[PDB]
Curated annotation (Swiss-Prot):
Function: Catalyzes the NADPH-dependent reduction of a wide variety of carbonyl-containing compounds to their corresponding alcohols. Displays enzymatic activity towards endogenous metabolites such as aromatic and aliphatic aldehydes, ketones, monosacharides, bile acids and xenobiotics substrates. Key enzyme in the polyol pathway, catalyzes reduction of glucose to sorbitol during hyperglycemia. Reduces steroids and their derivatives and prostaglandins. Displays low enzymatic activity toward all-trans-retinal, 9-cis-retinal, and 13-cis-retinal.
Residues with N6-acetyllysine modification: K95, K261
Residue(s) at site: Lowers pKa of active site Tyr: K78
Biological process per Gene Ontology, one example term: epithelial cell maturation
Tissues in which the protein is found: Highly expressed in embryonic epithelial cells (EUE) in response to osmotic stress.
Quaternary data: Monomer.
Organism of this sequence: Homo sapiens
Known regulation of activity: Cys-297 may regulate the kinetic and inhibition properties of the enzyme, but does not participate in catalysis. Tolrestat inhibits retinal reduction.
Residues annotated as the enzyme's active site: Y49
N-acetylalanine PTM positions: A2
Primary localisation category: cytoplasm
Gene giving rise to this polypeptide: AKR1B1
Family, per entry: Belongs to the aldo/keto reductase family.
Protein name: Aldo-keto reductase family 1 member B1
Effect of K78M: Reduced glyceraldehyde oxidoreductase activity
Source species taxonomy: Eukaryota, Metazoa, Chordata, Craniata, Vertebrata
Amino acid sequence: MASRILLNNGAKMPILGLGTWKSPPGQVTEAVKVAIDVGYRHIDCAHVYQNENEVGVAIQEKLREQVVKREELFIVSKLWCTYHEKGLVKGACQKTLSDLKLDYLDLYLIHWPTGFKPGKEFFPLDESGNVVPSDTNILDTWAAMEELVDEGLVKAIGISNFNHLQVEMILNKPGLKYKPAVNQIECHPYLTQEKLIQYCQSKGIVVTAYSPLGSPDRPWAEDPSLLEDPRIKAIAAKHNKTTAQVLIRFPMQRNLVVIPKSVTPERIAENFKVFDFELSSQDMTTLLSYNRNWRVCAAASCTSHKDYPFHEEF
Ligand SMILES: NC(=O)c1ccc[n+]([C@@H]2O[C@H](COP(=O)([O-])OP(=O)(O)OC[C@H]3O[C@@H](n4cnc5c(N)ncnc54)[C@H](OP(=O)(O)O)[C@@H]3O)[C@@H](O)[C@H]2O)c1
């Protein structure tokens, strides 16, 4: 299968990228350098991960050394929740650009539909354990995202962790100028997302699957473990691949983009070797059968936010 998917802005997005959430700053520079050396062209970043400077060191070095050209890279970042205000969006994008040592992003996402009170703290909370919201609504944040396209800071804009009515609220927005190119959502065999994926794809919005391996290094982890699931290990054995490779190929065959995270050189290389085998239709349906509606990222402290995404069915 092809290495890239056509977005609704006319650009092509590599269907396999390197995730960087939790990648330690002292390891993520090597991780991104290795990834580019072994063929990754898509890096998934975020200001809230606090490691974009070190990601940027790697990108800049590989550009300087002519390992890759900028036009060949697809760099993604995300606007954090405390910058949903109209007057903060541009500065937030420019800080990310500065840290990444780039003059444009290929894709910039609203990281969550939930706006938080602006300030130094990424998660301002009150005594109920609930986040302090901002009164910005998502349509105004979307228009500020649209301005970044028209200023040349980003080639495409999108959303992340939006449920289907929130996607629809953008798509229905009066005076909408740019449709979201992408909705990045958690997706894996324990959270298969059939309904939201079919909705987005029917609209020409590409879906990116995050936490494809079930985020075994997530801070709040004995819960389900995709990588140790004997049923998935059995499918991997049948194909003479690793469990991780099956878990990465799975979304690819649903016409999703997928962004496994690793800081381990051997795994970074191994995770990219997924274009040389095919899961059968029966394999695909079997993997889908494992859905348990289990989320790595439930945003536990935001469940009373008016824009909390995970109340609605999808
Ligand atoms: N939009 C959002 O709100 C959001 C939320 C979550 C994630 N994301 C993005 O999605 C990316 C991926 O999700 P994630 O970081 O949650 O988790 P993940 O990619 O599902 O899993 C990462 C974990 O799997 C390990 N691993 C990687 N390859 C492996 C292999 N071949 N064999 C065994 N273990 C392997 C990694 O270990 P090592 O690193 O030690 O090798 C790490 O502990 C994130 O990094 C981020 O870029 C976005």
